[PDB]
Symmetry: C2
Subunit: 93 residues, 2 copies
C-alpha cells in the first residue's frame, strides 16, 4: 500500500518463498527459517556488528529449530538481526 | 541489498521520516510512533481483522507513550499490526 506497507508486503513474499516446508503455508519451521535468514538476510549477516546479538538469535533457534514461526515472528527475528548490523551508528569511522 | 534487505532498509527510511523528536534520529518516542503508524500503516489499520490485537498495541502504547522505541521495536509493532490485518487466513469466505 504505502511505502511502508509495500515494504511489509515484500516481507510476506520472502517469507512465503520458504514457507510451507512443514505443510502449513502461512508458517515456516524454525530450522527452515535459518535457511531463509542465511540466504536473503545474508548481506546483513556479512555486515553484522553485534556478534553477540547475531549469535544470540541463531544459536537460540538452532536448538529450538524443530518448532515453527509465522510472519510476525519471522519479522521480529529479521529486525533483530537488522539492528545487530546497524549498531555501527555509534561507530564514527 | 537483497529483496528482503531492501524491504528492511525501507523500514529504516520511513522510521527516520518521523524520528528525532527526542533529538536522537535512530529513536522515536512511543506516542510519536503512533502518528507514524496512523499515517503510513493507515491502510493496514483500515484492513484490521483482529480488533483485540490492534487495540492491544494502541491502548498499551497510549499509556506507555512517553517512552521511546528504536527501529527494532518499531518493526515488531508494525509486524504485529500486519498480522492483525492478515487474519483472513482463518476466515472461510
Amino acid at each position: 500500500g504505502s511505502e511502508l506497507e509495500t515494504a511489509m508486503e515484500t516481507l510476506i513474499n520472502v517469507f512465503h518463498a520458504h514457507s510451507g516446508k512443514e505443510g502449513d503455508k502461512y508458517k515456516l519451521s524454525k530450522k527452515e527459517l535459518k535457511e531463509l535468514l542465511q540466504t536473503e538476510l545474508s548481506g546483513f549477516l556479512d555486515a553484522q556488528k553485534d556478534v553477540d546479538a547475531v549469535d544470540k538469535v541463531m544459536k537460540e533457534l538452532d536448538e529450538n529449530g524443530d518448532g515453527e514461526v509465522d510472519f510476525q515472528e519471522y519479522v521480529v527475528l529479521v529486525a533483530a538481526l537488522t539492528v545487530a548490523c546497524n549498531n555501527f551508528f555509534w561507530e564514527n569511522s
